């Protein structure tokens, strides 16, 4: 199983449909990796919308925008999984489960690119 875009999507779709609240920590760790990899499939310009969608999904206040956006930004810019590993280490299991559940609920339905020019062109191709 090679980690193509489609395999990534199929993996995300599978786990999005799981209730991971009782998942083994080892699998949860891998899901954080999945979320990080998937985050990096979004243009940087889309991270604000990703954050906003997360807040709405989870009924979180706007005062939570800063920390949530920061997580997405630092996953997006992560090198060698450094931030990802720090996040895993620092956060409690429950927080990680909730974040990953939320991400998998929103990531598949959110556009990965926002650029109007780009969106226009691609629309004429979609079958």
């Amino acid at each position: 199983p090679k980690i193509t875009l489609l395999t990534l999507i199929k993996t995300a779709e599978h786990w999005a449909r799981q209730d991971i609240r009782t998942i083994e920590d080892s699998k949860l760790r891998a899901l954080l990796t999945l979320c990080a990899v998937m985050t990096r499939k979004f243009s940087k310009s889309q991270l604000s919308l990703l954050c906003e969608t997360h807040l709405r999904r989870e009924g979180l206040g706007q005062d939570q925008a800063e920390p949530v956006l920061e997580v997405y930004q630092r996953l997006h810019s992560d090198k060698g999984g450094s931030f990802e590993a720090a996040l895993w280490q620092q956060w409690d299991r429950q927080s990680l489960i909730m974040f990953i559940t939320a991400f998998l609920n929103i990531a598949l339905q959110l556009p990965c690119e926002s650029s109007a020019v780009v969106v226009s062109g691609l629309r004429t191709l979609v079958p």
Partner: peptide, 13 residues
Amino acid sequence: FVPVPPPPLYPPP
């Protein structure tokens, strides 16, 4: 060095 941000706080029910 930049500390890991805290997880979001959920509203109390």
